[PDB]
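About this split. The held-out portion is used to measure sequence recovery: a designer receives only the structure tokens and must propose an amino acid at every position. Recovery is the fraction of positions where the proposal matches the reference. Here is one held-out target exactly as it appears in the evaluation file.
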């Protein structure tokens, strides 16, 4: 469980994310694909993009990163009261896209790296631990949901 001040730190840096959701999404996507290329194999629509600039230029990748970050922000603003928001994301990612919890750890790393690379002044050691606990909770809860749907990833 997170404290109230932990959630405040989480939402305080997310308000900075929401100034440019599309650019944060591009960066987190591209950091995901570069740090762990097997993850790009899950995107039939994006695994033809070969260089960084092709990813940056893809309107279709940009839109999708806004979609990703919008759903995550909605989860974070529920401060752990996210079953309603999390179940659809569990359904699709367990039974359709088939995303193991490691891929979720990979993107949590990407998120924390981009957050630090755009907002150091606002993402020091407490904010960074608070965001870390929030994403840990998301990964724990969504793993329990994966299991409920019969997916062991
Ligand atoms: C914080 C983590 C994540 C959040 C909040 C998130 C959320 C979403 C949302 C809202 C969509 C569109 C609707 C849906 O299919 O559920 C989506 C699509 C998708 N997501 Fe995730 N997602 C992330 C985890 C991942 C990871 C780790 C991968 C791959 C390694 C991945 C790739 C999948 C794929 C393959 C689609 C379909 C993309 C398409 O063809 O349009 N996602 N994701
Ligand atoms: Mg994605």
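Reference sequence for scoring:
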């Amino acid at each position: 469980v997170l404290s109230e001040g932990e959630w405040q730190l989480v939402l305080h840096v997310w308000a900075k994310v929401e100034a440019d959701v599309a650019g944060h999404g591009q960066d987190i996507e591209i950091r995901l694909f570069k740090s762990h290329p097997e993850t790009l194999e899950k995107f039939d629509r994006f695994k033809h993009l070969k260089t960084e600039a092709e990813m940056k230029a893809s309107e279709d990748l940009k839109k999708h990163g806004v979609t990703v970050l919008t759903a995550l922000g909605a989860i974070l603003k529920k401060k752990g009261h996210h079953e309603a928001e999390l179940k659809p994301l569990a359904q699709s990612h367990a039974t359709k896209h088939k995303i193991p919890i490691k891929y979720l750890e990979f993107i949590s790393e990407a998120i924390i790296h981009v957050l630090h690379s755009r907002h150091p002044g606002d993402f020091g050691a407490d904010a960074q631990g608070a965001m870390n606990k929030a994403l840990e909770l998301f990964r724990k809860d969504i793993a329990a949901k994966y299991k409920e749907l019969g997916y062991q990833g």
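Annotator remark: The two ends are 23 Å apart (CA to CA).
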